[PDB]
Design a protein around this ligand. Sequence first.
Ligand SMILES: NC(=O)c1ccc[n+]([C@@H]2O[C@H](COP(=O)([O-])OP(=O)(O)OC[C@H]3O[C@@H](n4cnc5c(N)ncnc54)[C@H](O)[C@@H]3O)[C@@H](O)[C@H]2O)c1
Ligand SMILES: NC(=O)c1ccc[n+]([C@@H]2O[C@H](COP(=O)([O-])OP(=O)(O)OC[C@H]3O[C@@H](n4cnc5c(N)ncnc54)[C@H](O)[C@@H]3O)[C@@H](O)[C@H]2O)c1
Lengths: 282, 282
Amino acid sequence: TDLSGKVAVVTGAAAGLGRAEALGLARLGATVVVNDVASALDASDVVDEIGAADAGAKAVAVAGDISQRATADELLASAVGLGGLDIVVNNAGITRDRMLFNMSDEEWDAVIAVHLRGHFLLTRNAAAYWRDKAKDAEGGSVFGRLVNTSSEAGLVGPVGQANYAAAKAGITALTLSAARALGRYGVCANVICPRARTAMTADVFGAAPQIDPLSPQHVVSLVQFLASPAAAEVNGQVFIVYGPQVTLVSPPHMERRFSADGTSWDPTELTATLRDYFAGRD
Amino acid sequence: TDLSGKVAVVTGAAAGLGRAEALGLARLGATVVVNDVASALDASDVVDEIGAADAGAKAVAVAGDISQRATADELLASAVGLGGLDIVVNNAGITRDRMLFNMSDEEWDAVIAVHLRGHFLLTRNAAAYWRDKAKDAEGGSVFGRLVNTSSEAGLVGPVGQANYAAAKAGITALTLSAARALGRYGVCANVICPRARTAMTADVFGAAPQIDPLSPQHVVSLVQFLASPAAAEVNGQVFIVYGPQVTLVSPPHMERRFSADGTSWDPTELTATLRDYFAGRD
Ligand SMILES: NC(=O)c1ccc[n+]([C@@H]2O[C@H](COP(=O)([O-])OP(=O)(O)OC[C@H]3O[C@@H](n4cnc5c(N)ncnc54)[C@H](O)[C@@H]3O)[C@@H](O)[C@H]2O)c1
Ligand SMILES: NC(=O)c1ccc[n+]([C@@H]2O[C@H](COP(=O)([O-])OP(=O)(O)OC[C@H]3O[C@@H](n4cnc5c(N)ncnc54)[C@H](O)[C@@H]3O)[C@@H](O)[C@H]2O)c1
């Protein structure tokens, strides 16, 4: 799964999971464009840490708020300047947790902006770059890998995280569309829903106690695959990954269909049917 | 399922499904606050049409872009001025379809704003109103019904609709959080994924040919239930509804787990396992 000669963009890569992902791609030979907000990069040695330095191992930092069009444009330009854009790992995020009934517009908008708009801007920019490259190839295949970061919160809607859950669910649907649009060009686009012990999850998961059962490395192993030639037949998939396991999420299932016997439901009859079903139901 | 004495807010109710939903609640006795953008209301007789007029049947139009905080505030104030807010049907939406690689930032932001931010602003405002009412009741139960509108596109990510799919998936996750926060106060919050023949779906579904198999009325019957006392035991549920059937969507299922036998996946081994699984897989 060697990534020599490839260029990867990883967002939110100053610390935590994004930093671990940037290091894992660098270790496979990728040239990594490391993105984060500038204050995160003030306090990070990640670029020095990416002197790991078997392989071309080149790394460059590009500071910017991923929710801004200009950041996505600069990342693309940096990657083109390094020889072409091959791999995108959308990982940047923030939380503004609040009970829904106390959540301000700003708490909502900020989380939507960094997760959902940020994923969009770079996914769209990459989408346009990869399609144009395929047309420039006179219909030839392009190598492209898109790895977007959702969360089990987007499947579940946890209390106090309506904004985080909404962004992560949107990210999943965004990536499925991208997979349908781009798979025909040779691009693979997939979604991960990780759990990893980082400084930002330490309050929920605890601190690290072989290998940490919630090591970021458990996630990196999957991201390395999804970024590689070897994932050519994996597109539009959603994975849950933490510890020594990866789980493929299936398409939506149906619990129960409630059909009228004729051309329309009688409304009081529909009411009776649903009310009875949910009276005896957990 | 009589809604006499209740007040309902329906957004996007000048035409199409929202208009049919406003009429169906009015027919059950609800006082309806009809919301849409003002240009939609220029061309609509919906308020006159809500002279149906058994029951209090009162209806008032409140024009506003639902993506703006002030519209959500005015709708709440109107409902309080009519005696209290009981029912919210978030239905307003737009499409800006485009292949992802051609999608502008504005095409993305507008669809996110009207669907996702609009759902949020009114869901949050209602959430704060219903909780405060319960506290004012010294812990007493409040009647509250929230009906949000997602889409099968949010489960599926169709080509050319990454922005629509992302908004609808976010709406679902938003509503699940709301259901967890608010169910304890007596509020029910549920999601519908409709198909209905409207002027805006006529290009995809065709025109209307008993009853139209894609009549908006098939959806209205479910919305009437979900807005009613009779749905007290239905909270946090996701329904697909079109024609003479309602389908309860189940929580996410897992297709297949890929576990290492020890404390971590060997990355080349994980690659081998996933590559083999997806070689022989549709
Ligand atoms: N829900 C879960 O179970 C779970 C657990 C771990 C990680 N995650 C997801 O994985 C990702 C990383 O999480 P983490 O555990 O590394 O925590 P983290 O706080 O380290 O987030 C990673 C990075 O995002 C960066 N970032 C924030 N705003 C940015 C912006 N506007 N532009 C660019 N970069 C920005 C931060 O600076 C940070 O370094 C996130 O998407 C997160 O939601 C989810
Ligand atoms: N994907 C599907 O299968 C499907 C089919 C039908 C309806 N739907 C959903 O149901 C809802 C209504 O769809 P429709 O079929 O009635 O089409 P429609 O175009 O009539 O949409 C309904 C209303 O939304 C209103 N609206 C738009 N922007 C607004 C804003 N900024 N503020 C307030 N109101 C605004 C429009 O003016 C319109 O009257 C939407 O949510 C739509 O996505 C989905």
